[PDB]
Design a protein around this ligand. Structure first.
Ligand SMILES: Cc1cc2nc3c(=O)[nH]c(=O)nc-3n(C[C@H](O)[C@H](O)[C@H](O)COP(=O)(O)OP(=O)(O)OC[C@H]3O[C@@H](n4cnc5c(N)ncnc54)[C@H](O)[C@@H]3O)c2cc1C
Length: 498
């Protein structure tokens, strides 16, 4: 039925939006297509780990997959599974696979927790219509506080076997003149210490992250969404996927919403209507809803910019083979702590996460997730035949990202006399994974598909809140930027529209 505000999804944009709506007294319903992850499974844990994947690992696939970079060591643990409403969805497009979370909390359930503010001068370049002073003065600090960002104890970091992998890359990078930075996180680093001491159940130190963390990680269900529920004005319905959006004849918006079980069986189709409609379905999900609505004629006044301007945050994965005297360790925390910041806003810019690997024995490999500045963009194009958005991105559009990553890591290899690994990303020789994305950005870009606060052009009381707003790149891990921009946007929307 009717409810004043509906929020589609429960990731970062959605969670911020719902909390502030509820605090403003607006009764709000959040619709999430995945599960509320709170039921102990067959091992007594909510989530499966990376060395024991099961159906919970995967959104409707029939076989588990190894985390990218890890196939050579983790294919042995893969198994056939029944298609199930699991937590991590590998979404396959023509020449790009985008990985997204599915559940109450969205990507916050599956991500590495890295909570980083973009460089102000880069923010100013990518979003020149946005007042950067309020972002840096007000909204970024608010986001970091609410998200419960915290910082690793450097003495513990320096001492612990669980971060040897990070220290090895730091030393190697330093021989090339390259520096590292500590990366703040939403994973409780005090908890992580006690894990190493054998004092509390392990999660990051038990090879968990990408299928969820049973402990330690402050995903959005614990932070913004808990607070939203606490207002008394917000509820969350799960296993509810919004399919269509239209503008009702008498005002407001109406949604068709499918309710499924965890096996994917359709239980019901419901119409839900509202006064205020907020899209927080992610870069992929929000954009799909809007291209569908435009091209099927249910939101005919959407503009041509809906679908445009997508990029993978310049994501490239690569790996180096260490010398035999530089082992990375059998025990690697699943939460990154250091990055290589070689980001100067030029086209050679790279911000690289020093990524753990989950094998649990010594491999001598250093793994990196590079974030680059690549101007190429893709477009989501509605396919009416299959009722799907398709992402028009081709692999050659990642050549600038590969080139930037390669130039940086070539400097490190030259300084150390090391070589790449070529075998971590399939049988063909391939040192740079260039057809995945963890950080999808764009599709409904701020100021192009929307006004400067995410109001969808052509419509009143229709808002986009999430990664689809970002113009393809932020130069850092994106969730803090999504969160801060959503804080800015919803405040203003409530003040002027609600
Ligand atoms: C492996 C991995 C590692 C990452 N590591 C980091 C990191 O360390 N730091 C960082 O900053 N970022 C990281 N990210 C990226 C980060 O998680 C995303 O940028 C962020 O979650 C995007 O937030 P969002 O609000 O746009 O959407 P999401 O968090 O993707 O949330 C969208 C939600 O909407 C739901 N949904 C979608 N369509 C519908 C629909 N039609 N109806 C109902 N519900 C719908 C989804 O199921 C989901 O719960 C990582 C991501 C992955 C996958």
């Amino acid at each position: 039925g009717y409810v004043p505000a509906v929020v589609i999804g429960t990731g970062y944009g959605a969670a911020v939006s719902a909390l502030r709506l509820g605090e403003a007294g607006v009764q709000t319903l959040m619709l999430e297509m995945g599960q509320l992850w709170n039921q102990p499974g067959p091992d007594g844990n909510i989530f499966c780990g990376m060395l024991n994947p099961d159906k919970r690992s995967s959104w409707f696939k029939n076989r588990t997959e190894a985390p990218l970079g890890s196939f050579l060591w983790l294919d042995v643990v893969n198994r056939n599974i029944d298609p199930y409403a699991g937590v991590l969805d590998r979404v396959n497009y023509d020449q790009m696979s985008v990985y997204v979370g599915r559940g109450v909390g969205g990507g916050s359930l599956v991500n590495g927790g890295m909570a980083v503010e973009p460089k102000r001068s880069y923010f100013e370049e990518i979003l020149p219509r946005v007042d950067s002073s309020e972002m840096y003065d007000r909204y970024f600090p608010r986001a970091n506080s609410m998200l419960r960002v915290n910082h690793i104890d450097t003495k513990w970091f320096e001492d612990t076997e669980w971060y040897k992998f990070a220290r090895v890359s730091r030393e190697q990078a330093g021989k090339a003149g390259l520096g590292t930075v500590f990366v703040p996180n939403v994973y409780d680093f005090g908890y992580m210490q006690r894990e190493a001491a054998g004092e509390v159940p392990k999660s990051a130190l038990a090879t968990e992250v990408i299928y969820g963390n049973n402990h330690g990680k402050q995903s959005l269900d614990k932070t913004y969404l808990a607070a939203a529920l606490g207002t008394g004005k917000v509820t969350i319905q799960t296993l509810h996927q919004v399919k269509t959006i239209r503008q009702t004849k008498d005002g407001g918006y109406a949604l068709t919403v499918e309710q499924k079980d965890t096996d994917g069986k359709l239980l019901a189709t419901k119409e839900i209507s509202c006064r205020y409609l907020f899209l927080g379905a992610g870069s992929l999900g929000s954009t799909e809803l809007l291209v569908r609505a435009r091209d099927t004629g249910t939101l005919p006044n959407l503009n041509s910019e809906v679908g445009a301007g997508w990029g993978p945050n310049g994501n490239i994965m690569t790996a180096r083979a260490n010398h035999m005297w530089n082992p990375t360790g059998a025990h690697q925390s699943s939460i990154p702590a250091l990055g290589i910041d070689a980001w100067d806003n030029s086209d050679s810019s790279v911000f690289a996460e020093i990524a753990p690997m989950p094998a649990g024995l010594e491999t001598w490999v250093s793994l990196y997730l590079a974030i680059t500045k690549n101007p190429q963009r893709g477009t989501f194009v509605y396919d009416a035949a299959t009722d799907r958005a398709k992402l028009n991105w081709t692999r050659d559009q990642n050549a600038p990202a590969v080139n930037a990553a390669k130039a940086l890591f070539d400097r490190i290899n030259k300084a150390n006399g090391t070589i790449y690994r070529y075998d971590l990303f399939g049988t063909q020789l391939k040192a740079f994974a260039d057809d995945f994305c963890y950080h999808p950005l764009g599709g409904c870009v701020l100021g192009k598909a929307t006004d400067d606060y995410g109001r969808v052009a052509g419509y009143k009381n229709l808002y986009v809140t999430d990664g689809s707003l970002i113009p393809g790149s932020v130069g850092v891990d994106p969730f803090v930027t999504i969160t801060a921009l959503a804080e800015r946007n919803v405040e203003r929307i409530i003040k002027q529209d609600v």
